[PDB]
Each structure stands twice: as C-alpha cells, then as structure tokens.
C-alpha cells in the first residue's frame, strides 16, 4: 500500500504521510486501521527511527505522531543511551527540554495538548534517570528558578517532579540496579529541601486551581518517602486539612495525601506530634461535616445516585477514616473533649458501611474487624463504642452473604462473633426482632429469611452452652411457626431449608439433645423423597454436615434405644436413598462411613461396613458373574453406568473410612482388577475398530470412567492405609500387573493420566518397600509418556502434570530406580527435567525445578563414587546453562526464586570442592586448574556469547559477586536481579555488583 512509504528510510520522511497513517490508525477503522497499525509498529521498531524524532516533533501537526516520536525516543534513552555519541545525548536533552518550554509558553497548546506534554515530561525523566545529577547538577536549582517566571511552567514542573519521584521511589525496584536506585534516591533526598520549599510556597500562596492540584499530586508521591519533619514541623497539615478540603477540586487529592500522612513514620512518645495528628483529623472531619455532608446523611443513597465524583470521594473517605483510626484512635479515646470526634468519625464509617458496593464493604469490614478485636482484648475500651457496635450488629446481619463470596462470609462471621462476645444480649435481641419482622411480613422475602438464617448460624459457639441452648430453641420454634404460616411448597421449602441450616450450625445443641437430633435426621430422610428443586441436595448436605460433627452420637447406644442409630440408618438405607440421584446416594454412604469409623471395636466396625455395602456388593456380585459370562453385556451402557456407580460408592465410603475400609476392599479387589482388564480390552477393541474418535464416544468414555474410578479407589485407600505390609504384599503386585502394560501398550489417546497419579501415591506410601516395583513403573510409563509431552507444551496437559509429580516422588523415595536406568534413559531423564524448566505452566515448572534440586542433592549424597563423578562430567554444565537460560529469557519470571536456588546450589558445589573430578576435558585448560577457575571461565564465555552487548568487565564483576554470594540467597538473588536489569541496556556499570559488599 501507499501508507507503507514511511518505512523507506533511504528517502526523507514525508511528515504528511506519517500523519495520515497515524490518523488512519487512531480515527479510522477495519482493514485500513489494521494495516496502518502494522505499519506504525514497523516504523517504531526500526532501530534508526529515533533519528527522525526531531523532524516529527518539529514539523508534525498531529499530536499522536509526536507521542509516537517520544515513544521511539523513550526506547532509545532506556536501552541504548550510553551507546550514543556524546553529541547526540546532549542534542536529545536540549531538544526535549526546548520542546517542553515552548509548549508551556503557549497557553493554547498547554491547555489542549496535555497528553503530549505529559509524555514529554516522562521522556525528560527518562533522561534524568540517565544524566542526573552527575551530569546535570543544576537541574533542580534551575527548575525552581523557572517556576517563578510562569504559572504554566510551575505547574508542569510539578508534573515532572511527580513523575521523577515515582520513577525513583515507587517503580525503581525492578527497573534499576540496587546501586543506581540508591544513587537516585539519595540524590532526590539531598535536594528535597529546595523542592519542598517551592511546593509549600505554591500551596500557601497560589490561587491557580490547576497549579495547586498538580502540586498536591506531587506531594502525594513525596509522602511515600520524605522525612516526617517536612510534614509535622511545617504548617502544611493545617493547609491540607482546612483550606484544601473546602474546594472540591483539591479535596480528592488532599484526602489521599492525608491518608498517606496517616502512614508516616511516627514517634509515639512526642506529645506535640500527637496533638498535630489529632488536630488535622479534627480539621478534616470538621470540613466534611460543614462542606460535604453531615454525619446523618444517607451515604448509601448518595453513592447509589453516583453523581459526579461522589463514589470515588466516599471510597477515599472510607480509606482515610479506616487508615487513620486503625493507627491513631487511641489518641482520641482518653480525652473527653475528643470523644465526639471519635464517635462522629465512626458514625461516618457506619454510614459508609451501608453502601451497596462489595469491595467498599470489604474495606470497611476490615476496619471493623480491627476495632472489635481490640475491644475484645483491650481493657476499658468497649463501653466507648457501645452505640457504634449496636449499629454495626444490624449492618452485618442485614448484609450477611451466603456461606456455602466465601471469603466475605468468613470475614463477616468473624466480626459478628466478636460483636456477640462484646454484648450477647444486644445480638440476641436484634436477631429475634429481625425474625419477628419476618413473621409479621414487614420484611418477609426469600432473600431476607436466608440472610437472617446465615447470620444466626454464624455465631454458634460464641455463647456459653446454657446461654446458647435457650437462644436456639427460641429461633427454631419461631422458624417452625414461620413455616406453618406460609402456604405453597415454594415458600415452605425456603423456610424448611433455613430451619435445617440453623440446626446444622449448632451441633453442640444437637449433641446434648439426642431425641431432637433423631427427629431432625428422620425429617431429613423424608426430604430425600421430595423432588422439589434443591430439597434433596439440601437434605443430603445437612445430613453429612450434622454427621461430621455429631457422629459419636450415632455410633453409641443412647438411653431408651435398643441399638446405635447407625444400625437403624443402614437397616432401611434402600428405602431412604431410593429417590436420590447417584451422586446424592454416594454422599449418603460417605456419611455412614464417617460414623462407622468411630466404632473402635474392629469386629463391630467390619460388621457395620459389610452391612452398609450390602446393596452395592450384591449388585457387584451379580454383574461380575454376568459380565464375565458375556463380555458383550459389558457393552451395555446401562451396565457400564451401574458398574461405575458401584465403584463410586466404594470410593465414597473409602474416603471417610480410610484404613478401616480394607475389609471391603478385600471383598472386591481381585474381581475389580479383572474388570479393569476386561474393560481395557474393550476400549482397545473399540479404538481398533472405530479409530481414535472412539475415545470421544459415550461408550468408551463410560468404560474409561470405570478404569478411572478403580484407580481412584485404590489411590484413595493406599493414601490412607496404615498397614503398609498388606499394601505391598497383597495390593501392589496385582495392581501393577493390571495397569502398567495396559498403559504402555495403548495408543497415547487411550492412556489414562490417572494411572500416573495412582502410581505417584503408591511410590509415595510404599516406594521405599518396592524397589523393583518402582523400576517396573518407570520402565512402563517413563519413555512413552515423555514422548507424548516433549513435542510441545500444550498437548496432554494432565499427563504432563502427573508425569513430573511421579518423577518427583520417585526421585525422592526411590532414587535407586534412576541409578538402574541405562545411560540413554538417564539422559532422557535429565532432558525431561530441563524440559520442565521451560514450561510456563506452574504445575510443571515448579516440580521440574524441585526435581533438579533434589537430584543434585541425591548425587551429592553419593559422595566420591564413579556415578556421581560421571554425572557432573556429563550434566553439571547442562543444568547450569539451562537454569541460566530460563533465568534470563524474561519468559519464566514466575520461577525466579527456585531458579536462583538451583543455580546457587550448583555454584556452591564447585566453591565447596564437592565435585571431585575436573569438570573440563584434559586438553581444554592446563592440568591442575581448579573447577572454580574453570567455572568462572565457562560462565564468562557463556554470557559473552549469549549477551554480546555486555562488556567483559560487566560479566567478570557479575560472576565475581555471584560467586562470592553463593551462601546468601537473598543477596545472591539481588545480584541476579541487577544482572537482569543490565542485560536490558547498554553500558551498565560493573561496580553495581559491589552493592552488597
């Protein structure tokens, strides 16, 4: 296209053409816009584009073109500044300075092109970071001088100073070396006295609102780092808390400034400072009540109306109040003349807490937590806040969210629990009254009764037992009455669900009253027949929730009972669970398992277990007899579903019973593994006959579900087994025979990652006991799984993750298995680990880095033996270089800490002489050369070739520092971070690496 003409640098740049491409990009659309976008990027990324920046900034009439010219210059200044001839550096400075001056002198430009000026100011700051103060000592003195000659220049200078402060103190950490950052921080500190004098003069005298605002914006930044004396020994707090709170223009920024002052470093023994801290709070609260809104104002309504900047202001007020009070409210609590101030401030917070805005509520709630926790512990404080706390009880109760937003509920619960301790009588009264208004209909709704029920449920365990007992009887009887009142299943379902929720939240009450507990459970069993949407889930959820807390009362024989209630549940389990979906039935069986495990008589426990599993065991026996007679019957989708649900039932019970499940596992184990084999053959047969697409079909997915559930069942038991002799002697050999060769000899798309997961648990638990078993696992899954996942980073994501979890535990528990590997396979192992380094996937990268570390340790533990010596000769520098690569390539930032740890471990091996043999070949360096010397040499050469723009001195200084620091991780990492900064630019200072010492 014609637009592409600007990409030809042999010809002079046609500014008119540039402006057209830019205009097409920003104001155009569609294909035109897209083409222009690609042209502009190519233009900007031309390494010689910066030379044409002055032409653009002078001769262009498009402010966007000039913006892009400054972006191009930014790139140059940031990365290649010290590469330029000195004349160009001076030339660029003068040009940028001159450009800013002229824009500020033109009132029309100054007001209409704020974006370009801000960009120009930022560009100036990039030059300052390079040049100031060592080659620009007069900058601040001259800045202050020029400020008095024009309001526009003064204002713009405040923007420059703001950005400078930001780049030096707020955003230097990851953009400069430690040494350069400290240099610039010290530099600004040295000259801030002058800067502050200017800023204060403007605030005290200035009348230009835009000037004052910019000045306050810069002050906000300063408050992040300046000495407290600048704030407290001057008159500036008076100005902030009075003058600038009255005008809405300055109000927003001033409030933000005062919030930061509430975070200034202060001594707490100086009584004069304390009075000043009280004073600016008093002034600020006075201005709000007089100029903005009284303490009685409906802030909920105001916020909802969302006029102008009201929402941001109320947000900022919340941050100010909570910040100040969390630190300084003790200053207001003793002096009686300060009591009204204290309570007015908290009353504003009460009003702010009624606002419908999730994130703002969390901010205020965090403060309330801070408050009530203090009142709970600190003597003689709670009586002060009685009226505040009473209001807060209502606010939190009325805004209670669903418990299941989970984090918010827990935070609300925590505060309300404190508030209940602080005044248990007031809390009860509020809740009972709240409930009374549900009953008279004044506030009745499904939402409202739910909210109230969550609130009531949240304070269980706060009252002493007898106190608690009286409360819950009242609530439940009241809820029971409310249930009668309502008509239609819709309404009664809601109230009934809330009844069961509250009861489920008060197990202490249930444990003390067996007859009531029994009645609740039998009522839950009735609900399991109710098809009304949600009722069956609610019944099952409540059942297992109550059982988890009260299980002991199901396993013992209660007074006036002929038997433990667990027997009674099991006797009629078929009827009870008849209308439940499979997943709900499993929950039911799982709950029964929880109870059975509390039976410590082994004979009785097993009897209960056999009785519980009667229905699934009988179904199991039948289909094992049928499906073995006719393997075709196993193709029946109904039978496959029945089989899966039987195994799932076993998984559910095994989950709650763990080690105690073993007798039931024994009943099914051998036939289960045979079923695994039979299903495996069917899957393979279907893939052969239909192709890979077979794996997508409901038939095969159903079959593989059987395999996955079988693996899950075995994994679940073994992870919880206490008798490891039985696991090894009885379970493991049949398991491995059943799953390993099937995995190995299936095509990739038919392999279940769950096999790897199961093996991980086996190695974890009993790996140390089955050394030959571990070898067999590796032989069967290692190479074929590696070949699935070593062509890219995306395919077979589950196999990928489980693969490195398995290697990690094998490396941990049975390292000997890797020693038995033939040389070629061990090389694949090393390759696999490095492959994991290069993943952006955290679930792989982390384990890969951990395997590498554990491996180096494993090798180290071997001492001076042939295998360790060969390992270092073969793989030491491979791990060093691979680790360095992911450290420096800017695409694995998430793994930095573990990368650094691994690198430090590797370097420390050499500088502790823990590597016995020479890491170099006999001909490479002279005989007798230490591995220390050769390591520095290897690394220096490696970094020279990988980062050719670094000087030899940079590389040498970096490696000298890094080497010296290989015992101090924190400092070591600091040196690495400095290196990562320096490779991004030209001409980094080698002495930066002396920062530590």
């Amino acid at each position: 296209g014609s637009m592409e003409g600007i990409l030809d640098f042999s010809n002079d740049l046609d500014i008119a053409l540039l402006d057209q491409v830019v205009s097409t990009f920003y104001q155009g659309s569609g294909v035109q816009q897209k083409q222009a976008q690609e042209i502009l990027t190519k233009f900007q990324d031309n390494p010689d584009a910066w030379q044409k920046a002055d032409q653009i900034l002078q001769f262009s009439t498009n402010p966007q073109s000039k913006f892009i010219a400054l972006s191009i210059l930014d790139k140059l200044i940031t990365r290649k500044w010290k590469l330029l001839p000195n004349d160009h550096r001076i030339g660029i400075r003068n040009f940028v300075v001159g450009m800013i001056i002229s824009m500020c002198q033109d009132d029309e430009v100054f007001k209409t092109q704020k974006n370009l000026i801000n960009k120009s100011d930022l560009t100036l700051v990039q030059i300052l970071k390079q040049e100031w103060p060592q080659n620009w000592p007069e900058f601040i003195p001259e800045l202050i001088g020029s400020s008095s000659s024009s309001v526009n220049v003064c204002e713009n200078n405040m923007i420059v100073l703001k950005l400078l402060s930001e780049e030096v103190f707020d955003f230097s950490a990851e953009q400069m070396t430690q040494a350069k950052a400290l240099h610039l921080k010290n530099s600004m500190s040295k000259e801030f006295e002058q800067i502050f004098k200017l800023c204060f003069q403007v605030l005290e005298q200035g009348s230009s609102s835009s000037l004052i605002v910019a000045t306050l914006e810069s002050l906000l930044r300063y408050l992040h780092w300046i000495p407290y004396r600048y704030i407290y020994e001057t008159n500036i707090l008076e100005l902030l808390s009075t003058k600038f709170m009255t005008s809405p223009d300055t109000r927003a920024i001033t409030l933000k400034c005062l919030t930061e002052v509430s975070n200034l470093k202060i001594p707490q023994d100086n009584d004069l400072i304390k009075r000043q801290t009280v004073l600016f709070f008093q002034n600020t609260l006075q201005q709000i009540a007089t100029s903005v809104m009284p303490v009685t104002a409906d802030l909920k309504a105001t916020y909802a109306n969302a006029n102008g900047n009201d929402q941001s202001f109320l947000q900022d007020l919340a941050m100010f109040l909570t910040t100040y009070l969390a630190r300084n409210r003790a200053l207001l609590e003793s002096d009686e003349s300060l009591r009204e101030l204290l309570l007015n401030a908290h009353q504003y917070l009460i009003q702010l807490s009624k606002i419908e805005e999730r994130e703002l509520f969390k901010t205020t709630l965090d403060y309330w937590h801070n408050l009530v926790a203090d009142l709970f512990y600190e003597p003689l404080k709670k009586h002060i806040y009685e009226e505040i706390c009473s209001q807060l009880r209502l606010v939190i109760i009325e805004n209670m969210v669903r418990p299941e937003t989970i984090q918010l509920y827990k935070s609300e619960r925590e505060v309300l629990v404190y508030l209940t301790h602080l005044n248990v009588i007031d809390t009860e009264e509020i809740m009972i009254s709240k409930l009374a208004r549900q009953i008279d209909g004044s506030e009745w709704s499904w939402h409202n009764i739910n909210t109230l029920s969550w609130a009531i449920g949240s304070i269980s365990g706060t009252m002493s037992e007898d106190t608690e007992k009286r409360f819950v009887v009242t609530v439940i009887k009241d809820l029971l009455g409310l249930c009668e009142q309502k008509r239609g299943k819709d309404n009664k379902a809601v109230v009934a669900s809330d009844i069961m929720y509250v009861v489920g939240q008060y197990p202490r009450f249930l444990k003390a009253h067996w007859n009531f507990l029994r009645t609740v459970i039998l009522k839950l069993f009735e609900f399991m027949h109710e098809t009304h949407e949600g009722v069956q889930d609610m019944a099952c959820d409540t059942f297992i929730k109550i059982v988890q807390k009260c299980k002991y009362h199901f396993v013992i024989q209660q007074p006036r009972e002929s038997e433990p209630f667990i027997q009674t549940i099991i006797r009629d389990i078929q009827k009870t669970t008849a209308d439940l979906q499979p997943q709900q039935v499993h929950t039911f069986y799982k709950a029964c398992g929880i109870i059975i495990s509390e039976e410590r008589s082994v004979a009785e426990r097993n009897r209960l277990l056999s009785d519980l599993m009667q229905l699934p065991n009988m179904a199991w026996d039948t289909i094992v007899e049928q499906s073995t007679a006719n393997p075709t019957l196993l193709l029946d989708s109904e039978t496959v579903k029945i089989i899966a649900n039987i195994i799932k039932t076993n998984v559910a019970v095994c989950t709650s019973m763990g080690a105690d499940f073993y007798p039931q596992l024994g009943h099914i184990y051998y036939n289960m593994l045979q079923l695994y084999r039979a299903v495996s053959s069917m899957i393979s047969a279907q893939v052969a006959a239909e192709g890979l697409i077979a794996t997508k079909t409901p038939k095969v997915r159903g079959l593989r579900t059987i395999k996955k559930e079988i693996l899950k069942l075995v994994e679940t038991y073994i992870s919880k087994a206490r008798n490891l002799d039985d696991v090894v002697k009885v379970l493991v050999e049949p398991l491995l025979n059943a799953v390993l060769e099937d995995y190995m000899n299936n095509v990739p798309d038919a392999r279940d990652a769950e096999v790897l997961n199961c093996m991980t648990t086996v190695v974890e638990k009993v790996g140390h006991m089955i050394p030959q078993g571990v070898i067999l696992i590796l032989q069967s899954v290692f190479e074929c799984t590696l070949d699935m996942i070593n062509k890219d980073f995306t395919e077979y994501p589950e196999h990928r993750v489980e693969f490195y979890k398995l290697l990690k535990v094998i490396n941990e528990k049975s390292f000997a298995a890797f020693l038995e590997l033939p040389p070629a396979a061990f090389k694949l192992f090393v390759d696999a680990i490095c492959w994991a380094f290069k993943h952006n996937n955290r679930d792989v990268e982390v384990n890969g880095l951990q395997i590498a570390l554990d491996l180096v340790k494993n090798i180290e533990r071997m001492g001076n033996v042939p295998f360790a010596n060969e390992f270092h000769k073969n793989y030491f520098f491979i791990f060093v270089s691979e680790t360095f690569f992911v450290l420096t390539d800017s695409d694995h930032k998430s793994g930095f800490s573990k990368q650094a740890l691994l690198l430090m471990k590797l370097i420390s091996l050499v500088y502790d002489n823990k590597i016995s043999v020479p890491l170099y070949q006999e001909a490479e360096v002279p005989q007798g050369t230490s591995n220390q010397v050769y390591l520095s040499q290897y690394l220096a050469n490696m970094l020279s070739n990988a980062f050719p723009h670094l000087t030899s001195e940079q590389i040498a200084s970096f490696l000298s520092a890094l080497t010296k620091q290989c015992k101090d991780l924190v400092v070591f990492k600091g040196t690495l971070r400095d290196f990562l900064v320096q490779i991004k630019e030209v001409g980094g200072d080698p002495t930066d690496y002396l920062f530590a010492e």
Partner: peptide, 15 residues
Amino acid sequence: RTFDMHSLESSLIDI
C-alpha cells in the same frame, strides 16, 4: 405433609 415440621415442634417442646 412433606414440609410438616410438627415432629420438630413436639420434640422441641418435650425439652
């Protein structure tokens, strides 16, 4: 019938 909680009431009054 299903949502008749009278059983809960009687057990609670019995306390």
